[PDB]
Amino acid sequence: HWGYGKHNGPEHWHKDFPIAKGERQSPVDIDTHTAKYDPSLKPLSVSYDQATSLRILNNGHAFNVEFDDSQDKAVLKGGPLDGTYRLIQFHFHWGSLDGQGSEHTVDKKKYAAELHLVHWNTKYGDFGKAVQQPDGLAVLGIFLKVGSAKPGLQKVVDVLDSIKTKGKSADFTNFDPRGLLPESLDYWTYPGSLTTPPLLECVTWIVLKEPISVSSEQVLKFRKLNFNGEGEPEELMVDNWRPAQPLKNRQIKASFK
Numbered sequence: 529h530w531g532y533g534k535h536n537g538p539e540h541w542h543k544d545f546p547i548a549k550g551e552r553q554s555p556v557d558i559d560t561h562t563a564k565y566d567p568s569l570k571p572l573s574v575s576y577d578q579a580t581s582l583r584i585l586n587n588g589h590a591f592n593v594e595f596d597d598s599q600d601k602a603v604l605k606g607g608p609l610d611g612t613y614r615l616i617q618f619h620f621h622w623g624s625l626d627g628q629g630s631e632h633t634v635d636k637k638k639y640a641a642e643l644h645l646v647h648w649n650t651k652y653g654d655f656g657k658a659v660q661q662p663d664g665l666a667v668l669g670i671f672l673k674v675g676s677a678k679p680g681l682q683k684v685v686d687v688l689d690s691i692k693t694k695g696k697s698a699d700f701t702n703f704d705p706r707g708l709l710p711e712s713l714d715y716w717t718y719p720g721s722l723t724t725p726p727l728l729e730c731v732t733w734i735v736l737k738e739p740i741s742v743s744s745e746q747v748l749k750f751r752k753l754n755f756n757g758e759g760e761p762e763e764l765m766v767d768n769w770r771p772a773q774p775l776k777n778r779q780i781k782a783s784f785k
């Protein structure tokens with residue numbers, strides 16, 4: 529099945545998932561000089577105070593911190609969004625080296641990693657129905673650079689040893705995603721897709737301009753994870769990022785002047 533290796537990586541996905549060569553695929557390079565300030569954008573609202581995390585899972589591609597989305601708790605609204613989007617999970621994409629790892633790039637610059645906080649449009653009832661709609665999902669993307677440690681990420685880092693291989697999960701309650709956000713909410717937004725198969729084009733991307741810094745030690749632990757399952761040859765979970773795709777007929781809007 530699909531992965532990030534030479535024989536099943538991004539360049540191969542289109543065979544099982546034709547939409548890989550679609551009209552609004554993600555990620556894309558964000559050309560900052562071509563992005564235009566949009567005064568029609570309303571202020572962005574990230575309300576994560578009532579967030580209820582449940583567990584963490586190694587799915588063989590990345591690790592997902594899942595949340596209880598059966599109620600109106602952690603929601604994203606405002607900005608380019610119409611309505612309320614509910615947080616269902618977050619995960620990261622990272623590299624084997626600090627010089628690569630992010631999916632979106634800024635003026636071709638690659639960051640060490642990228643955090644994706646996934647939300648679904650409540651007007652559609654649930655995540656499954658949402659992914660059949662062009663405005664069913666909203667993903668808040670945050671870049672990670674290596675520098676000072678991020679205190680709010682350490683709880684995630686310390687539980688990774690317990691979910692080293694594909695299929696493993698661990699209880700992960702009371703984790704506050706507010707500790708992963710940078711100070712500024714300035715962002716770029718464009719219509720795109722999931723960056724992993726099935727690559728569905730149901731996403732409104734909101735990529736924050738300000739990256740958060742994490743320590744070399746923190747990202748090093750991300751790289752100790754495994755793509756393989758327990759009892760299988762070890763294949764380090766690194767470089768699980770899809771490269772920038774053609775922007776095609778799209779414009780990236782900026783929330784700032």
Ligand SMILES: O=C(NO)c1ccccc1
Nearest residue numbers: 644646665667722723724
């Ligand atoms: O960011 C994602 N993949 O990398 C993603 C986004 C929405 C739903 C599932 C996955």
Ligand SMILES: [Zn+2]
Nearest residue numbers: 619621644723
């Ligand atoms: Zn992602």
